[PDB]
From Swiss-Prot:
The family this protein is said to belong to: Belongs to the plakin or cytolinker family.
Protein modification: Phosphorylated by CDK1; regulates dissociation from intermediate filaments during mitosis.
Domain notes per entry: The N-terminus interacts with actin, the C-terminus with vimentin, desmin, GFAP, cytokeratins, lamin B; whereas both the N- and the C-terminus can bind integrin beta-4.
Function, in words: Interlinks intermediate filaments with microtubules and microfilaments and anchors intermediate filaments to desmosomes or hemidesmosomes. Could also bind muscle proteins such as actin to membrane complexes in muscle. May be involved not only in the filaments network, but also in the regulation of their dynamics. Structural component of muscle. Isoform 9 plays a major role in the maintenance of myofiber integrity.
Subunit comment: Homodimer or homotetramer. Interacts (via actin-binding domain) with SYNE3. Interacts (via calponin-homology (CH) 1 domain) with VIM (via rod region). Interacts (via N-terminus) with DST isoform 2 (via N-terminus). Interacts with FER. Interacts with TOR1A. Interacts with ANK3. Identified in complexes that contain VIM, EZR, AHNAK, BFSP1, BFSP2, ANK2, PLEC, PRX and spectrin. Interacts with COL17A1.
Tissue expression summary: Widely expressed with highest levels in muscle, heart, placenta and spinal cord.
Disease with which this protein is associated in UniProt: Epidermolysis bullosa simplex 5C, with pyloric atresia: A form of epidermolysis bullosa, a genodermatosis characterized by recurrent blistering, fragility of the skin and mucosal epithelia, and erosions caused by minor mechanical trauma. EBS5C is an autosomal recessive disorder characterized by severe skin blistering at birth and congenital pyloric atresia. Death usually occurs in infancy. Epidermolysis bullosa simplex 5B, with muscular dystrophy: A form of epidermolysis bullosa, a genodermatosis characterized by recurrent blistering, fragility of the skin and mucosal epithelia, and erosions caused by minor mechanical trauma. EBS5B is an autosomal recessive disorder characterized by progressive muscular dystrophy associated with generalized skin blistering.
Subcellular location field: Cytoplasm, Cytoskeleton; Cell junction, Hemidesmosome; Cell projection, Podosome
Name the UniProt record assigns to this protein: Plectin
Amino acid sequence: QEESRCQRCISELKDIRLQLEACETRTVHRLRLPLDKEPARECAQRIAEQQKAQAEVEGLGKGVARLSAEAEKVLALPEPSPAAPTLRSELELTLGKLEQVRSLSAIYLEKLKTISLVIRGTQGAEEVLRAHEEQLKEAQAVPATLPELEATKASLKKLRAQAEAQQPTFDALRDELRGAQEVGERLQQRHGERDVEVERWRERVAQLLERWQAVLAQTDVRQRELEQ
């Protein structure tokens, strides 16, 4: 009539392990998807989504704890039970899967958060560089008068000071990209999944650095022209 607690526990353990495996596959499919053409917004949205995913996993973990307690109660009865090894085996598989899915959920969330810092940081650097690149372009004009020359020279002095002052911004950007790269590598090493996102932002950072270096270098050239 009523099935044994042993058989019911085996069934429930298999069921919850399937739900964990589904969380797992879901997460793999997400982390394989590169950001598209609105990376800031998409990344914030995906972070929110992954925080929930991670909470769903923790709810399953509480189910696993409940089934583990029940399993151990059954396994502790003194009577012979040829089913006991199956119950033990299924418990240990479910417990292992839980840890694996927890790990993966946490590292993917971490990957998203580090990428989000690089994205924010690069978009900030763009807006400052644009201002500086325009000031420099304006300083390229030939001044008409001796007084305009002095204004151009003053504009360049200002520009150099402003551009040099961005040192902290670019140091932090490089650190953030380093952070993002390291997370991706650990995901690769621990879960065998390549980092589909980091190359885009490595290139972004590299180009922005080069533009910053060029503002500094060409400001110095232009200042030197006007002195001699």
